[PDB]
Structure 1
């Protein structure tokens, strides 16, 4: 395999399906990435994560740098070896979680473009995120501009740091992050700036920050076409099943007691499930739905048992992976419009 090769196999309107080939594996797109916080996808062994269909997981730089530490993970062989996941890992830059300051970077109590890229290198990340400056929502045009401009300066710094490390440049990929809040002109300037520097993929940053779905979709309508068509488009911090379907309709390729079902989410703790022998979802192919009832999982979660968390998480990630598979198949078959309509009529 190559370091990085993104190929589009099929399109329907703005939606695309294809593959990212990397040294550690192939990523099917549109892709959903389970999140590893502190070097573990919560309550799952890596083999269980894989069994759900995930091709790639996300690691959080902010949390790993604090515990157990980036240099320590490198001394132990890198993140993949440490946690036992041998396929691609995307690492965020750490910037977001710092927020949830100067032109050089940020200092905080328990980072810079250069230090973020270095930490991601020490972890052994396959997809490295440029270090950006968070724009809160809402933001005035002046402040959104100032932060976007700083982020573009930091994108160049991130590029140059990554490139100046040969092993990283040869084995990993680097994604840039579009900023600009909800403002079309600022999104355009940001896309232009990122394309001029050149990245392996382009994230839409700054959304899912409190603006609501209608507004997010409005911004995606004009923002995703600004990005290079031939590279992956990553919507950071999204999301809910319906958000994913609408974002794919707008050209996004990658994403990162409540149980998901094709009729909508349920809260398994509710008393109505105490004697319900049905699986969490009636069609779901996951191992949880094959073997255990709603009634048992209700009991486990209300009892605070670890197995409850294990079973709920495996089901939910499997559900998301089945969603992504149905999206990929429908786009490849030229019936994604109908899938999205059918999905919404029932989920709601």
Structure 2
């Protein structure tokens, strides 16, 4: 395999399906990336994450640079070896989660474009995110513009830091992040600056920060077409099933979110008929699986009533089973989206999905 090759195999409207080939593996797009924190996808062995269908996972830079330390992980052989995941890993740049002392050089809380890129190198990341300033929502246009402009200066710094390190440049990929809050002109300036610099993929940053789905979709409507069509489009931090479907309808190829893992541990199970909270007393004697159609190992073997008991009791197996189901559900969603675009029936799928999910 190549360092990086994105190929689009089929299209429907603005939606695309295809593949990213990297040295450590192939990523089917549109892709959902389960999130680790602290070098683990919470409550799952890597082999379980893979069995759900995940092709890539996100590593948590912020946590790891604090514990156990990026240099320690490199000493130990890198994140893949450390945690036992041998397929691609995307790492965020660490600044969204830091967001103490902010300046043009970076932030102390320390992190700069150069140090972020070096930490991701030490971790052995396959997809490296440029270091950016996420812009709070709402933002005035002045503030949005200042932030975006800083982020684009930091994007060039990130590019040059990555390219400076031969090992990294030859084996990893680098994504830039579009800012500009909800303002179309700032989103355009941002897209143009990133395209001039040139990246292997382009994230849409600064969304899912409190604006709500209608506003998120409105900004995606104009923002995603601004990015280079022939590179992947990553919507950071999104999201709920219905958010994913509409974002693919608007040209997004990649997704990450803590929703399935975090809310699973809290009792929320995704189903094709909408989310359920398994702690609810109505499930205490319900012998059906979490979802009626789901192919995961959890739905093949255990009832709602058992998982209800486990979560009510605070048992670790409860978090394990809920998280495996939720991540499997997300992967099954992505598979249905891929197959429906490939068959030219995604718009029908989206409508059918919504009718039933919100029934």
Report the TM-score range of the alignment, normalised by the length of the smaller protein: over 0.9
1: distance between equivalents of 2:49 and 2:70? 23
1:211 aligns to what? 211
1:60 deviates by 1.1
1:134 deviates by 1.3
Aligned residues: 346
The superposition leaves residues 12-39 of structure 1 with CA deviations (integer Å, 9 ceiling, x where unpaired) of 0000000000000000000000001000
The superposition leaves residues 157-204 of structure 1 with CA deviations (integer Å, 9 ceiling, x where unpaired) of 000000000000000000000000000000000000000000000000
Match of 1:305 among 315, 330, 334: 315
1: distance between equivalents of 2:63 and 2:190? 28
Q: Which runs of 4+ in 1 moved over 2 A?
A: none
SS at match of 1:55: coil
1:237 aligns to what? 237
- Computed over aligned residues only, the root mean square deviation of the Cα atoms, in angstroms, reads 0.6
Q: What TM-score does the superposition give when structure 1 sets the normalisation length?
A: 0.99
- Gap regions ≥5 residues in structure 2: 257-266
1:14 aligns to what? 14
2: distance between equivalents of 1:214 and 1:134? 20
2: distance between equivalents of 1:63 and 1:185? 34
SS at match of 2:11: strand
1:248 deviates by 0.0
1: distance between equivalents of 2:209 and 2:176? 19
1: distance between equivalents of 2:207 and 2:34? 19
1:104 deviates by 0.1
SS at match of 1:33: strand
Question: Is 1:44–2:54 an aligned residue pair?
Answer: no
Q: What TM-score does the superposition give when structure 2 sets the normalisation length?
A: 0.96
1: distance between equivalents of 2:151 and 2:40? 29
1:229 deviates by 0.1
1: distance between equivalents of 2:8 and 2:174? 19
2: distance between equivalents of 1:276 and 1:201? 45
2: distance between equivalents of 1:165 and 1:272? 57
2:194 aligns to what? 194
1: distance between equivalents of 2:325 and 2:120? 30
1: distance between equivalents of 2:117 and 2:36? 18
- Gap regions ≥5 residues in structure 1: none
SS at match of 2:62: helix
SS at match of 1:234: strand
The superposition leaves residues 127-176 of structure 1 with CA deviations (integer Å, 9 ceiling, x where unpaired) of 00000011000000000000000000000000000000000000000000
Matches within 5 A, 1:103-252: 103-108=104-109, 111-252=111-252
SS at match of 1:6: strand
